[model samples]
Target: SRNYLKNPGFETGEFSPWRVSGDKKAVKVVKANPSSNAHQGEYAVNFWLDESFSFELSQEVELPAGVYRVGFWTHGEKGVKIALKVSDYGGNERSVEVETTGWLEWKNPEIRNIKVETGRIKITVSVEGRAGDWGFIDDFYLFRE
Candidate 1:
């Protein structure tokens, strides 16, 4: 099936349907660069700053009670720690830590057995980094079998 999340690619040219908090400038949408930022689309989420920072980007959606998987594509530096978190579902909160091997490389990190409820679930992408840290996140997704 298709992705259950909106603005999955940030191709809307804006961060709508997705919620962001803390160090807003640390997380912004920009033109896609498969060589660095975006994995496929014309835009992707970028995380960077001149000083140490932390921020979260998220979206809420409704899905029937069942098991699902959440994942996204990311590319970043070693100092930047990005995590994908799922909450508000009937199951225990789950988080997947994204690893950064090097620049110009993208990786898909996902979590399964999300165990969602018959209500809204929150999909959160968060990052923590030291000054000058940088990274990219794109193609957020949620799927069920």
Candidate 2:
């Protein structure tokens, strides 16, 4: 009935329970700069680097079997690519490429109607780009449909 994922907003200011792989240094948890950049809380996840890098942030949760959806708020920079992914929840892998319209601009992207026959789901966000590319993410959710 409610969101089952912890650190949903990254308000804890760290990636404690979340898992990360690949270019780990490319991703980080920090307090919201400019304040408005954080979709809903005081902190958010950031991705960037002076060189090309790729990395991912993810969390797994056990849930009641049913229809579900996963989502998050994102603010991306041009020339960078960010993807939201959902898997291991008894449905086909679902992904959505995040887009940027302007600096500090936020968009909510969701992968919906995932049928969770099992009781677990993994939500992940992958980011990649050349030097100077960057993005922000926060306010994640995994809840029943």
Candidate 3:
């Protein structure tokens, strides 16, 4: 079995528009002000990437020595790039990136297994590109495979 959480935390502003779309197709967060603080503006955004504008996870999860799989749901459009990352509590991390032409479901969930040396893990999703476009996330979960 796996556990999941929904819309943990977020912030939005007129410049950075973030809202649940009327059709419920996605969570729309737009960044109109490049000068706006990415970490502290209207969105309670906390993830930071490697300067390439990638998405990184800040929250950490703990796991026992065993096999596990991590999954998250997302949708986006127009040359946007989304990345998924997994890292041990000790700070080691790995990532996978996907490009989308328009809004669509994650065709195949990404999975990985490793010998657990620590009790904590972290997972994150991120995007890079212009603002005004939209992206959707739903049903994030972690499971023991």
Candidate 4:
């Protein structure tokens, strides 16, 4: 029921604890320019989009049976797609995602609520960053809603 994420903000100087999914291993952690990027920290995780529409990043955690919320701030151009999901060990899962068309600022996916059935779930964020579609994830948090 509590916060199950260790480095929600990517401030640890490295991606520890948070696991990359599907062996794609394409997620990159970069230091954001606070003065220009409006990032939450000097560092943020980026899902780079190239000619290939392939990406998967996730982290698993254990928690008690309860409702919780997950969310983060985003930056980049329009046409970027992101799917955020929360799944539990009892085969329970939910996702909240969106296609962004905003520029010069960051977008935030409001906290989404999900139920835990097996005291375990994975927070997976799949991104579709194509041409003119790079996205940065900052201040990601999964805590009791």
The lDDT leader among the candidates is 2
In terms of lDDT, the poorest run of 10 residues in model 2 is 98-107
What are the lDDT scores of the predictions, listed in order? 0.84, 0.85, 0.47, 0.71
Q: Write the per-residue lDDT of candidate 4 for residues 101-120, one digit (tens) a residue.
A: 76546777754557777888
For TM-score, candidate 3 versus 4, the one ahead is: 4
lDDT of 1 by residue, 31-54 (tens): 865535687678988888999999
- Candidate 3 structure lDDT: 0.47
Off by over 4 Å in 1: 33-36
How well is each residue in 11-35 modelled by candidate 3, as lDDT tens digits?
Answer: 3332122222122222334442342
Can you rank all candidates by TM-score, best first?
2, 1, 4, 3
Looking at model 3, report the run of 10 residues with the lowest lDDT sum: 14-23
Per-model TM values vs. the true structure: 0.92, 0.94, 0.58, 0.82
Q: How far is candidate 2 from the true structure (C-alpha RMSD, Å)?
A: 1.3
Worst 10 residues of 4 by lDDT: 32-41
Sorted on lDDT, best first, the list reads 2, 1, 4, 3
TM-score (C-alpha, index-matched) for candidate 3: 0.58
lDDT of 4: 0.71
Name the runs in model 3 displaced over 4 angstroms.
Answer: 4-57, 89-91, 105-109
lDDT assessment of candidate 2: 0.85
